Amino acid sequence: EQVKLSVELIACSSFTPPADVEWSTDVEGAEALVEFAGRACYASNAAYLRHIMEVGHTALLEHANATMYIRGISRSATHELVRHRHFSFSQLSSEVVVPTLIDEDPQLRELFMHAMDESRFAFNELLNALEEKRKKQARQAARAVLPNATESRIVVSGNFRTWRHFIGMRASEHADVEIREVAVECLRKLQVAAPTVFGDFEIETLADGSQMATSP
Protein backbone atom coordinates (compact mmCIF):
# COMPACT_ATOMS: atom_id res chain seq x y z
CA GLU A 1 0.00 0.00 0.00
CA GLN A 2 1.22 3.48 -0.95
CA VAL A 3 1.63 6.13 1.75
CA LYS A 4 2.42 9.85 1.57
CA LEU A 5 4.63 12.03 3.78
CA SER A 6 3.01 13.30 6.97
CA VAL A 7 5.02 15.42 9.42
CA GLU A 8 3.54 16.37 12.80
CA LEU A 9 5.02 18.76 15.37
CA ILE A 10 4.65 16.90 18.67
CA ALA A 11 6.95 18.93 20.95
CA CYS A 12 8.18 22.49 21.42
CA SER A 13 9.82 24.39 24.30
CA SER A 14 7.46 25.66 27.01
CA PHE A 15 8.92 28.76 28.67
CA THR A 16 8.49 30.21 32.16
CA PRO A 17 10.56 33.21 33.33
CA PRO A 18 12.21 33.20 36.78
CA ALA A 19 10.05 34.95 39.40
CA ASP A 20 12.65 37.44 40.68
CA VAL A 21 13.86 38.51 37.22
CA GLU A 22 12.21 41.76 36.06
CA TRP A 23 11.36 40.91 32.44
CA SER A 24 8.27 40.57 30.23
CA THR A 25 7.70 39.64 26.56
CA ASP A 26 4.94 39.57 23.92
CA VAL A 27 5.45 35.97 22.72
CA GLU A 28 4.90 32.60 24.45
CA GLY A 29 7.14 29.51 24.42
CA ALA A 30 10.32 28.77 22.46
CA GLU A 31 10.82 32.29 21.05
CA ALA A 32 10.55 33.80 24.54
CA LEU A 33 13.22 31.29 25.64
CA VAL A 34 15.63 32.33 22.86
CA GLU A 35 14.95 35.97 23.79
CA PHE A 36 15.67 35.32 27.49
CA ALA A 37 18.89 33.46 26.64
CA GLY A 38 20.01 36.40 24.48
CA ARG A 39 19.33 39.10 27.08
CA ALA A 40 20.84 36.89 29.82
CA CYS A 41 24.25 37.43 28.20
CA TYR A 42 24.08 41.06 29.40
CA ALA A 43 12.55 46.07 21.82
CA SER A 44 9.88 43.44 21.08
CA ASN A 45 10.46 39.69 20.58
CA ALA A 46 10.28 39.76 16.76
CA ALA A 47 12.56 42.81 16.63
CA TYR A 48 15.07 41.11 18.94
CA LEU A 49 15.17 37.73 17.17
CA ARG A 50 15.71 39.51 13.84
CA HIS A 51 18.81 41.13 15.35
CA ILE A 52 20.12 37.80 16.69
CA MET A 53 19.90 36.31 13.18
CA GLU A 54 21.31 39.46 11.53
CA VAL A 55 24.49 39.39 13.64
CA GLY A 56 24.51 35.58 13.30
CA HIS A 57 24.70 34.54 16.95
CA THR A 58 22.96 31.21 16.30
CA ALA A 59 24.31 29.63 19.51
CA LEU A 60 21.26 31.15 21.25
CA LEU A 61 18.86 29.11 19.10
CA GLU A 62 20.29 25.97 20.74
CA HIS A 63 18.11 26.37 23.86
CA ALA A 64 14.81 25.96 21.99
CA ASN A 65 13.95 22.42 20.86
CA ALA A 66 11.28 20.87 18.63
CA THR A 67 10.22 17.26 18.03
CA MET A 68 8.68 15.86 14.85
CA TYR A 69 6.79 12.63 14.27
CA ILE A 70 7.43 11.77 10.61
CA ARG A 71 5.40 9.15 8.73
CA GLY A 72 5.49 8.20 5.04
CA ILE A 73 9.26 8.59 4.72
CA SER A 74 11.24 5.93 2.83
CA ARG A 75 14.16 4.00 4.36
CA SER A 76 16.60 5.90 2.10
CA ALA A 77 15.37 9.38 3.09
CA THR A 78 15.44 8.22 6.72
CA HIS A 79 19.11 7.29 6.20
CA GLU A 80 19.79 10.76 4.76
CA LEU A 81 18.01 12.24 7.80
CA VAL A 82 20.11 10.35 10.38
CA ARG A 83 23.30 11.60 8.69
CA HIS A 84 22.54 14.81 10.60
CA ARG A 85 24.28 13.90 13.85
CA HIS A 86 22.90 16.60 16.17
CA PHE A 87 19.40 15.08 16.05
CA SER A 88 18.09 12.39 18.38
CA PHE A 89 16.05 9.58 16.82
CA SER A 90 13.50 6.92 17.66
CA GLN A 91 12.73 4.73 14.66
CA LEU A 92 10.13 1.99 14.12
CA SER A 93 11.86 -1.37 14.65
CA SER A 94 2.92 -3.18 4.48
CA GLU A 95 3.58 0.47 3.60
CA VAL A 96 5.64 1.83 0.70
CA VAL A 97 6.81 5.32 -0.36
CA VAL A 98 6.80 6.14 -4.09
CA PRO A 99 9.11 8.86 -5.50
CA THR A 100 7.23 11.83 -7.01
CA LEU A 101 8.85 11.26 -10.43
CA ILE A 102 7.41 7.71 -10.56
CA ASP A 103 4.10 8.56 -8.83
CA GLU A 104 3.14 11.17 -11.47
CA ASP A 105 3.31 8.49 -14.18
CA PRO A 106 0.56 5.81 -13.88
CA GLN A 107 2.53 3.46 -16.16
CA LEU A 108 5.64 3.77 -13.99
CA ARG A 109 3.66 3.50 -10.74
CA GLU A 110 2.07 0.22 -11.90
CA LEU A 111 5.58 -1.14 -12.53
CA PHE A 112 6.92 0.22 -9.21
CA MET A 113 4.07 -1.29 -7.17
CA HIS A 114 4.59 -4.59 -9.01
CA ALA A 115 8.24 -4.60 -7.91
CA MET A 116 7.11 -3.79 -4.35
CA ASP A 117 4.93 -6.92 -4.43
CA GLU A 118 7.85 -8.97 -5.82
CA SER A 119 10.00 -7.97 -2.84
CA ARG A 120 7.17 -8.73 -0.38
CA PHE A 121 6.62 -12.15 -1.99
CA ALA A 122 10.36 -12.87 -1.81
CA PHE A 123 10.41 -11.68 1.82
CA ASN A 124 7.46 -13.85 2.92
CA GLU A 125 8.85 -16.91 1.10
CA LEU A 126 12.36 -16.59 2.60
CA LEU A 127 10.97 -15.97 6.10
CA ASN A 128 8.89 -19.17 5.94
CA ALA A 129 11.84 -21.30 4.84
CA LEU A 130 14.06 -19.76 7.54
CA GLU A 131 11.48 -20.45 10.27
CA GLU A 132 11.08 -24.05 9.04
CA LYS A 133 14.44 -25.08 10.51
CA ARG A 134 16.69 -17.38 16.61
CA LYS A 135 13.48 -16.31 14.84
CA LYS A 136 14.49 -12.69 15.53
CA GLN A 137 17.52 -13.53 13.37
CA ALA A 138 15.36 -15.13 10.66
CA ARG A 139 13.38 -11.88 10.34
CA GLN A 140 16.45 -9.63 10.05
CA ALA A 141 17.97 -11.96 7.44
CA ALA A 142 14.76 -11.89 5.37
CA ARG A 143 14.58 -8.07 5.64
CA ALA A 144 17.65 -7.94 3.37
CA VAL A 145 15.42 -8.23 0.26
CA LEU A 146 13.20 -5.28 1.28
CA PRO A 147 13.58 -2.18 -0.94
CA ASN A 148 14.63 1.39 -0.03
CA ALA A 149 11.01 2.49 -0.59
CA THR A 150 9.85 0.70 2.58
CA GLU A 151 8.13 3.22 4.87
CA SER A 152 9.73 3.99 8.22
CA ARG A 153 8.21 5.98 11.07
CA ILE A 154 10.60 8.23 12.99
CA VAL A 155 10.59 10.57 16.00
CA VAL A 156 13.19 13.33 15.56
CA SER A 157 14.30 15.98 18.06
CA GLY A 158 16.88 18.75 17.79
CA ASN A 159 17.41 22.37 18.75
CA PHE A 160 16.39 25.26 16.47
CA ARG A 161 19.95 25.69 15.17
CA THR A 162 20.09 21.99 14.20
CA TRP A 163 16.73 22.43 12.42
CA ARG A 164 17.86 25.65 10.71
CA HIS A 165 20.93 23.73 9.54
CA PHE A 166 18.94 20.71 8.30
CA ILE A 167 16.47 22.89 6.37
CA GLY A 168 19.18 25.19 4.96
CA MET A 169 21.05 22.21 3.48
CA ARG A 170 18.21 19.95 2.34
CA ALA A 171 15.44 22.35 1.27
CA SER A 172 17.82 24.18 -1.11
CA GLU A 173 19.56 21.45 -3.17
CA HIS A 174 17.65 19.71 -5.99
CA ALA A 175 18.93 16.80 -5.64
CA ASP A 176 17.73 15.11 -3.55
CA VAL A 177 13.94 15.16 -4.10
CA GLU A 178 12.41 13.31 -1.11
CA ILE A 179 14.68 14.83 1.57
CA ARG A 180 13.67 18.29 0.26
CA GLU A 181 9.96 17.59 0.72
CA VAL A 182 10.68 16.35 4.25
CA ALA A 183 12.73 19.50 4.97
CA VAL A 184 10.08 21.86 3.52
CA GLU A 185 7.30 20.21 5.57
CA CYS A 186 9.45 20.45 8.72
CA LEU A 187 10.10 24.16 8.11
CA ARG A 188 6.38 24.81 7.51
CA LYS A 189 5.50 23.41 10.95
CA LEU A 190 8.38 25.35 12.54
CA GLN A 191 7.15 28.58 10.91
CA VAL A 192 3.81 28.10 12.67
CA ALA A 193 5.58 27.38 15.98
CA ALA A 194 8.37 29.97 15.67
CA PRO A 195 7.48 32.65 13.05
CA THR A 196 10.55 34.87 13.59
CA VAL A 197 13.26 32.19 13.98
CA PHE A 198 12.16 30.63 10.67
CA GLY A 199 10.69 33.64 8.81
CA ASP A 200 13.82 34.31 6.74
CA PHE A 201 13.15 31.13 4.74
CA GLU A 202 10.99 31.58 1.64
CA ILE A 203 9.00 28.59 0.40
CA GLU A 204 8.54 28.55 -3.38
CA THR A 205 7.08 26.04 -5.84
CA LEU A 206 9.32 25.09 -8.76
CA ALA A 207 8.26 24.51 -12.39
CA ASP A 208 8.01 20.74 -11.82
CA GLY A 209 5.59 21.17 -8.89
CA SER A 210 7.94 20.35 -6.01
CA GLN A 211 8.74 22.93 -3.33
CA MET A 212 12.00 24.43 -2.08
CA ALA A 213 13.07 26.89 0.62
CA THR A 214 15.91 29.43 0.49
CA SER A 215 17.42 32.02 2.84
CA PRO A 216 19.64 35.10 2.24
Curated annotation (Swiss-Prot):
Gene: thyX
GO terms for MF: flavin adenine dinucleotide binding; NADPH binding; thymidylate synthase (FAD) activity; thymidylate synthase activity
Domain ThyX: 5-204
Name of the molecule in the record: Flavin-dependent thymidylate synthase
UniProt motif ThyX motif: location: 83-93
Binding residues for FAD: R83, H84, R85, Q91, N159, F160, R161, H165
Active site: R170
UniProt keyword annotations, A-Z: FAD, Flavoprotein, Methyltransferase, NADP, Nucleotide biosynthesis, Transferase
EC numbers on record: 2.1.1.148
